[PDB]
Curated annotation (Swiss-Prot):
Disulfide bonds: none annotated. It comes from Homo sapiens. It is found in: Cytoplasm. Keywords: Cytoplasm, Retinol-binding, Transport, Vitamin A. GO terms for molecular function: fatty acid binding; molecular carrier activity; retinal binding; retinoid binding; retinol binding. All-trans-retinol binds at residues 40, 108. GO terms for biological process: epidermis development; fatty acid transport; vitamin A metabolic process. This is Retinol-binding protein 2. The keyword Transport applies. InterPro entries: Calycin, Fatty_acid-bd, ILBP, Lipocln_cytosolic_FA-bd_dom.
Length: 133
């Protein structure tokens, strides 16, 4: 199941604060951001993806082509330069962001009408579940 198209509304969020701490996000931002429900909008056509992560506090958008490395500035998240690559491991979409932080990236996959996400950085893992709206 590779079709991740849709507007995805958060149902569950685990260890989001630990992931933000691993990125060195400042105290004030974390305390506010950890409270918030997230939305994920994914536009997927072949290898081309357009991903938007939103809350009332942020809007993080990235476009990429599966299998094509891209240099990336992580902008309002943590203002770092990484070399990013998104690929398929079966039906798990896997992103690796090479740079200052170890084990940095994410994984997304579908189960039923839900989208599961792992956000990793350092020794931290944030687990999220979204429902298709
Ligand atoms: C596929 C998920 C992303 C590209 C995300 C970028 C920032 C996120 N959060 C702050 C939750 S998710």
């Amino acid at each position: 199941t590779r079709d991740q198209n849709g507007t995805w509304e958060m149902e569950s969020n685990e260890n989001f604060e630990g992931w933000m701490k691993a990125l060195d996000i400042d105290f004030a931002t974390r305390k506010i951001a950890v409270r918030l429900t997230q939305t994920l909008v994914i536009d997927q056509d072949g290898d081309n993806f357009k991903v938007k992560s939103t809350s009332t506090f942020w809007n993080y958008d990235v476009d990429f082509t599966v299998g094509v490395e891209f240099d990336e500035y992580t902008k309002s998240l943590d203002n770092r330069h990484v070399k990013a690559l998104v690929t398929w491991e079966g039906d798990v979409l896997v992103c690796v962001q090479k740079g200052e932080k170890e084990n940095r990236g994410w994984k997304k996959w579908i189960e039923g009408d839900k989208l599961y996400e792992e956000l990793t950085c350092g020794d931290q893992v944030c687990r999220q579940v979204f429902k298709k709206k």
